[PDB]
Write a protein that binds this ligand. Structure first.
Ligand SMILES: *[C@@H]1O[C@H](CO)[C@@H](O[C@@H]2O[C@H](CO)[C@@H](O[C@@H]3O[C@H](CO)[C@@H](O)[C@H](O[C@H]4O[C@H](CO)[C@@H](O)[C@H](O)[C@@H]4O[C@H]4O[C@H](CO)[C@@H](O)[C@H](O)[C@@H]4O)[C@@H]3O)[C@H](O)[C@H]2NC(C)=O)[C@H](O)[C@H]1NC(C)=O
Ligand SMILES: *[C@@H]1O[C@H](CO)[C@@H](O[C@@H]2O[C@H](CO)[C@@H](O[C@@H]3O[C@H](CO)[C@@H](O)[C@H](O)[C@@H]3O)[C@H](O)[C@H]2NC(C)=O)[C@H](O)[C@H]1NC(C)=O
Ligand SMILES: *[C@@H]1O[C@H](CO)[C@@H](O[C@@H]2O[C@H](CO)[C@@H](O[C@@H]3O[C@H](CO)[C@@H](O)[C@H](O)[C@@H]3O)[C@H](O)[C@H]2NC(C)=O)[C@H](O)[C@H]1NC(C)=O
Ligand SMILES: *[C@@H]1O[C@H](CO)[C@@H](O[C@@H]2O[C@H](CO)[C@@H](O)[C@H](O)[C@H]2NC(C)=O)[C@H](O)[C@H]1NC(C)=O
Ligand SMILES: *[C@@H]1O[C@H](CO)[C@@H](O[C@@H]2O[C@H](CO)[C@@H](O)[C@H](O)[C@H]2NC(C)=O)[C@H](O)[C@H]1NC(C)=O
Ligand SMILES: *[C@@H]1O[C@H](CO)[C@@H](O[C@@H]2O[C@H](CO)[C@@H](O)[C@H](O)[C@H]2NC(C)=O)[C@H](O)[C@H]1NC(C)=O
Ligand SMILES: *[C@@H]1O[C@H](CO)[C@@H](O[C@@H]2O[C@H](CO)[C@@H](O)[C@H](O)[C@H]2NC(C)=O)[C@H](O)[C@H]1NC(C)=O
Ligand SMILES: *[C@@H]1O[C@H](CO)[C@@H](O[C@@H]2O[C@H](CO)[C@@H](O)[C@H](O)[C@H]2NC(C)=O)[C@H](O)[C@H]1NC(C)=O
Ligand SMILES: *[C@@H]1O[C@H](CO)[C@@H](O[C@@H]2O[C@H](CO)[C@@H](O)[C@H](O)[C@H]2NC(C)=O)[C@H](O)[C@H]1NC(C)=O
Ligand SMILES: *[C@@H]1O[C@H](CO)[C@@H](O[C@@H]2O[C@H](CO)[C@@H](O)[C@H](O)[C@H]2NC(C)=O)[C@H](O)[C@H]1NC(C)=O
Ligand SMILES: *[C@@H]1O[C@H](CO)[C@@H](O[C@@H]2O[C@H](CO)[C@@H](O)[C@H](O)[C@H]2NC(C)=O)[C@H](O)[C@H]1NC(C)=O
Ligand SMILES: *[C@@H]1O[C@H](CO)[C@@H](O[C@@H]2O[C@H](CO)[C@@H](O)[C@H](O)[C@H]2NC(C)=O)[C@H](O)[C@H]1NC(C)=O
Ligand SMILES: *[C@@H]1O[C@H](CO)[C@@H](O[C@@H]2O[C@H](CO)[C@@H](O)[C@H](O)[C@H]2NC(C)=O)[C@H](O)[C@H]1NC(C)=O
Ligand SMILES: *[C@@H]1O[C@H](CO)[C@@H](O)[C@H](O)[C@H]1NC(C)=O
Ligand SMILES: *[C@@H]1O[C@H](CO)[C@@H](O)[C@H](O)[C@H]1NC(C)=O
Ligand SMILES: *[C@@H]1O[C@H](CO)[C@@H](O)[C@H](O)[C@H]1NC(C)=O
Ligand SMILES: *[C@@H]1O[C@H](CO)[C@@H](O)[C@H](O)[C@H]1NC(C)=O
Ligand SMILES: *[C@@H]1O[C@H](CO)[C@@H](O)[C@H](O)[C@H]1NC(C)=O
Ligand SMILES: *[C@@H]1O[C@H](CO)[C@@H](O)[C@H](O)[C@H]1NC(C)=O
Lengths: 130, 441, 130, 48
């Protein structure tokens, strides 16, 4: 128990790791998104960062995943987007490769999530009406 | 059968190439550290394993940002200083011939003129020693800049010594550093780390030679955007430094002339003792060994039986035709002709002395209409520096001949910054991700 | 099935529609609230917009309606605020007209919502204490 | 025709036409310009 070292994966350390292993350290990435002429540029950069953070949070809230890092949904996975099974995704791939593969099927999923969440909200209101 | 569903993750380790504005980090100077943040005493680096990135030193925006920031700082430093508007007068000059050698004949002019005083109804008669490069004949002369624009005098308290500067990125961005030795600035880097910000970079201004820089850890490195094209400069990084000793030996004197209410002009009074040329020294054996290494590395790209020649500069302005630098406030322009003069064929204590000149009216950056008058420095001046690289250009290059001739180059200061920021790049994080998963809300 | 146009109600297109119909497109409006001397004014405008968005989000959160576009509450509807029935509100009126009508009974409703949510939180804590 | 208060004579009247009316005008003198250096990097342009 003496002569042993302890090291933790820091910030982007899990970039090269698989998706399943990289999904266990989302908090370290999440915490780092927030934190005369030159002052103008610095303040513009700060405002842009704040705006990007607020945009991402607004999208998450609109999809109904507010306040969650992992939030599984009701939208089924169309096979046209991808054909690979879970064995070859969560244990034989990384997030960068997945982003490169799926970069052209992103907006339609967002619209589907928005419409689905609107439908769930309407149904919840109707249920609570009774 | 798949029954998979979209699931959202926030905080995934994904990034994209992006451009942003970095800020200071540093531990009276022209490079003002007052508006620059303090640096962390213990910088942190995170080595990313299995991450191979793409790098291109010739498309880095950090070089442009550094150039703009350096120019802005230089402009800011000169604002609260005296403007030498009244100095455009008819000077009457005479040759200086007291204890001069055979190579300093005609370089110095003893010029008398009329000048204003604190009271606007009085005049005084004064004299000063000017350099031949500063005065143009109109026994009557005028300053070289008088028909282009009036321009200011550097305040005598600010120091020109470079200070290291670190560049740290904003929130939501990251700086990736390529730790792969032998990396020639373009292509894939298997070995990468993440840094909060870069090592201290001294903004050293020089041409034809890179001084007080960083050294390759393994061997001499040659870099070029397109080595087949002769219109692109070649950056050579040495493995070991070459010491160079420069000196101005004249025992100068400084005097102050009051040209108005709270405004002084610093003139060269007289020179004590003998008058001799300023010069630089570089060791001969070390230079020969360095050139041997350089030609050995050059043979890799230009054939194994090719004859490699080093010749003189082509021509142009004094800034680009000569190794120009600043040694303790005095602006030297020196003739690097004994260095790049030799031919190489495939198969003790003396030193090379470069004699060279000094100037006082300076157009630092490639601009017209703004000078900078350097006040004289009192006494003898001497400095020592490390040569750690070269900027070369290949002339001609047609297939008619099998001899390759390389000549010194320079002028553009972006090449000086490029040699330091070659292994860094900036990216922006993309924390939103989507994957298949087997729940359902 | 050829020679047919598809047009979607855009941004404030539902401004003239009834309340019930206008309540089906809240997302398009919600998404649009976020996105040397002149730079100061532009940055001031951006900061003001961000502050307004954050104020509205805080007001929503304090009432317990965080992360929802249609959130129902527990406060009963006082008849003094409006005597009209649901038939003459959600099918025969517009949001602008309703805002004009109830523009003078707004703050008291906000205070009632705040107090109700505080009481609900206290009761939930007491329930979990067991 | 637009006016804030057409009964009040102190308010201007804005008239907007239905079609445009073309107007052509010229200075026909063949002028000449010369430069006079009044200081370091300062020129004054005069009619020669
Ligand atoms: C590459 O790096 C090397 C070293 O890393 C550089 O060489 C060093 O250069 C500096 C600056 O020239 C030099 O420091 C000076 O040493 C002088 C001799 O000891 C000092 O006199 C001088 O102090 C004066 O200047 C300061 C501002 O720089 C003032 O703050 C100070 O008060 C002094 O000024 C007084 O004296 C002058 C002259 O009499 C007078 O006019 C003033 O009014 C005032 O009264 C500096 O401390 C180092 O000694 C050098 N190092 C070595 C080993 O030689 C080299 O320059 C770099 N190369 C390039 C290209 O930048
Ligand atoms: C960078 O990539 C390398 C491989 O390219 C990663 O090493 C690999 O790590 C996995 C899991 O840690 C190893 O899988 C293991 O295999 C053994 C034998 O099949 C099995 O018994 C275990 O249960 C596990 O599945 C894999 O063998 C290993 N590869 C090699 C060549 O050793 C490495 O982890 C990556 N870096 C990071 C930071 O993730
Ligand atoms: C702008 O306003 C007009 C009317 O003010 C809207 O048109 C109205 O639309 C409603 C529903 O779409 C119609 O209701 C219908 O009423 C008849 C009555 O017999 C009923 O049989 C139908 O089943 C239906 O409920 C209403 O008639 C119609 N008004 C007119 C004059 O035709 C219009 O929709 C509004 N614009 C927008 C963008 O909402
Ligand atoms: C530059 O010229 C001035 C003026 O001719 C010289 O100053 C004179 O020096 C002599 C002695 O050498 C004195 O007797 C005079 O009184 C000085 N004149 C004034 C106006 O002070 C000066 O020595 C010359 N400098 C050099 C380097 O030749
Ligand atoms: C400084 O000004 C004086 C006069 O204010 C100059 O002396 C005159 O020089 C001109 C020649 O250009 C003669 O025609 C005058 O007769 C002189 N007047 C006097 C009173 O001496 C003097 O030359 C000026 N100094 C310099 C260095 O130009
Ligand atoms: C010129 O190069 C030499 C050798 O690289 C420098 O001496 C080194 O200075 C560093 C300071 O960071 C020390 O850590 C090394 O141990 C030194 N090496 C040797 C062999 O002495 C020298 O400082 C350089 N000169 C200048 C002006 O930069
Ligand atoms: C590097 O430079 C060479 C020389 O310009 C490029 O090759 C030339 O390409 C042009 C393009 O039209 C041709 O007209 C020339 O005939 C080519 N010359 C030779 C000697 O091949 C070359 O393409 C450049 N490299 C890259 C990557 O662009
Ligand atoms: C550059 O080299 C020359 C010799 O080539 C040096 O000149 C010698 O300088 C020393 C100074 O200590 C004198 O003692 C010698 O008498 C000089 N010899 C000759 C022939 O001039 C010169 O000092 C060197 N300069 C620098 C800055 O290193
Ligand atoms: C440049 O200057 C340095 C320091 O003045 C010289 O180094 C000295 O060289 C002498 C003679 O070999 C030694 O006695 C000293 O011990 C050295 N001092 C240091 C600090 O290294 C160097 O030789 C000069 N180089 C050239 C080319 O002139
Ligand atoms: C590089 O070397 C050549 C060859 O010596 C230099 O050309 C000389 O230029 C001077 C002008 O200052 C002439 O007086 C000589 O006659 C030229 N030499 C020959 C052999 O004709 C050239 O100037 C050198 N480069 C630089 C930048 O000075
Ligand atoms: C740079 O140095 C070289 C070498 O001294 C100069 O070339 C000499 O120029 C003079 C002209 O004054 C000739 O008389 C010599 O014959 C030249 N030397 C050789 C070996 O050819 C060159 O002129 C210098 N650069 C400049 C701009 O003057
Ligand atoms: C338009 O202008 C007329 C003329 O000023 C206004 O009528 C006048 O109102 C003042 C207000 O005290 C009276 O003293 C005048 O006697 C009125 N004159 C006439 C001729 O009626 C009229 O009020 C203005 N319109 C509006 C809408 O304010
Ligand atoms: C304005 O109208 C006058 C006529 O009233 C024009 O004068 C004629 O200009 C033409 C130019 O081609 C000449 O050929 C005629 O000889 C002129 N006639 C007279 C009586 O002057 C004048 O050119 C017009 N100007 C413009 C700008 O349209
Ligand atoms: C000054 O000396 C130079 C070089 O010897 C010469 O060309 C010039 O004519 C001289 N001027 C004089 C004596 O006025
Ligand atoms: C100033 O004079 C020099 C030499 O007389 C000349 O080369 C230069 O072109 C002049 N500048 C301008 C702006 O005319
Ligand atoms: C050197 O640069 C060239 C430029 O095209 C590139 O192809 C090559 O891969 C680089 N060398 C290394 C070792 O990356
Ligand atoms: C320069 O001159 C001054 C004044 O005479 C003297 O004090 C100083 O020692 C001289 N410097 C040298 C290097 O001789
Ligand atoms: C250039 O090199 C040649 C060797 O052929 C030599 O004779 C000549 O003196 C050199 N020139 C200089 C300026 O060193
Ligand atoms: C004005 O004069 C110039 C110079 O004589 C001439 O070239 C030009 O044609 C003249 N313009 C007209 C409109 O006659």
């Amino acid at each position: 128990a003496v002569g042993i070292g302890a090291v933790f994966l820091g910030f982007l350390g899990a970039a090269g790791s698989t998706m399943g292993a990289a999904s266990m350290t989302l908090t370290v990435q999440a915490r780092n998104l927030l934190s005369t002429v030159w002052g103008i540029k610095q303040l513009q950069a700060r405002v842009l960062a704040v705006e990007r953070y607020l945009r991402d949070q607004q999208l998450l809230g609109i999809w109904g995943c507010s306040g969650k890092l992992i939030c599984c949904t009701n939208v089924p996975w169309n096979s046209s987007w991808s054909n690979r099974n879970l064995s070859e995704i969560w244990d034989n791939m990384t997030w960068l490769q997945w982003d490169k593969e799926i970069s052209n099927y992103t907006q339609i999923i967002y619209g589907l999530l928005e419409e689905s969440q609107n439908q769930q909200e309407k149904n919840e209101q109707d249920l609570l009406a009774l | 059968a798949e029954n998979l569903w979209v699931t959202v993750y926030y905080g995934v380790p994904v990034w994209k190439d992006a451009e942003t504005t970095l800020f200071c980090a540093s531990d009276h100077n022209v490079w003002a550290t007052h508006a620059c943040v303090p640096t962390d005493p213990n910088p942190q680096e995170i080595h990313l394993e299995n991450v191979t990135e793409e790098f291109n030193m010739w498309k880095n925006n950090m070089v442009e940002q550094m150039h703009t920031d350096i120019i802005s700082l230089w402009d800011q430093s000169l604002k609260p200083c005296v403007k030498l508007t009244p100095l455009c007068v008819t000077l009457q000059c005479t040759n200086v011939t007291n204890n001069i050698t055979d190579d300093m004949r005609g370089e110095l002019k003893n010029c008398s003129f009329n000048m204003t005083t604190e009271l606007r109804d009085k005049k005084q008669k004064v004299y000063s020693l000017f350099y031949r490069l500063d005065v143009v004949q109109i026994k009557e002369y005028r300053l070289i800049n008088c028909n282009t624009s009036a321009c200011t005098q550097a305040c005598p308290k600010v120091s020109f010594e470079p200070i290291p500067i670190h560049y740290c990125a904003p929130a939501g961005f990251a700086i990736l550093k390529c730790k792969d030795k032998k990396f020639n600035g373009t292509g894939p880097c298997p070995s990468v780390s993440t840094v909060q910000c870069t090592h201290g970079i001294k903004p050293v201004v020089s041409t034809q030679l890179l001084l007080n820089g960083s050294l390759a850890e393994e061997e001499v490195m040659i870099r070029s955007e397109n080595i087949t094209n002769n219109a692109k400069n070649i950056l050579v990084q040495f493995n070991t430094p070459v010491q160079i000793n420069c000196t101005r030996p004249n025992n100068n004197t400084r005097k102050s002339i009051r040209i108005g209410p709270g405004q002084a002009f610093y003139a060269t009074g007289d020179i004590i003792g003998d008058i001799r040329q300023a010069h630089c020294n570089v060791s001969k054996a070390t230079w020969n060994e360095t050139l041997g290494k350089v030609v050995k590395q050059l043979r890799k790209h230009f054939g194994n039986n090719t004859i490699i020649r080093f010749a003189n500069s082509s021509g142009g302005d004094l800034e680009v035709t000569t190794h120009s630098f600043n040694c303790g406030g005095e602006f030297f322009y020196c003739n690097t002709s004994g260095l790049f003069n030799s031919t190489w064929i495939s198969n003790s204590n003396d030193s090379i002395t470069l004699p060279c000149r000094i100037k006082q009216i300076i157009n630092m950056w490639q601009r017209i209409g703004q000078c900078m008058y350097a006040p004289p420095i009192q006494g003898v001046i001497r400095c020592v520096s490390n040569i750690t690289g070269l900027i070369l250009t290949r002339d001609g290059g047609s297939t008619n001949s099998t001899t390759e001739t390389f000549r010194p180059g320079g002028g553009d200061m972006r090449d000086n910054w490029r040699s330091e920021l070659y292994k860094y790049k900036v990216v922006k994080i993309e924390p939103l991700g989507v994957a298949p998963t087997r729940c359902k809300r």
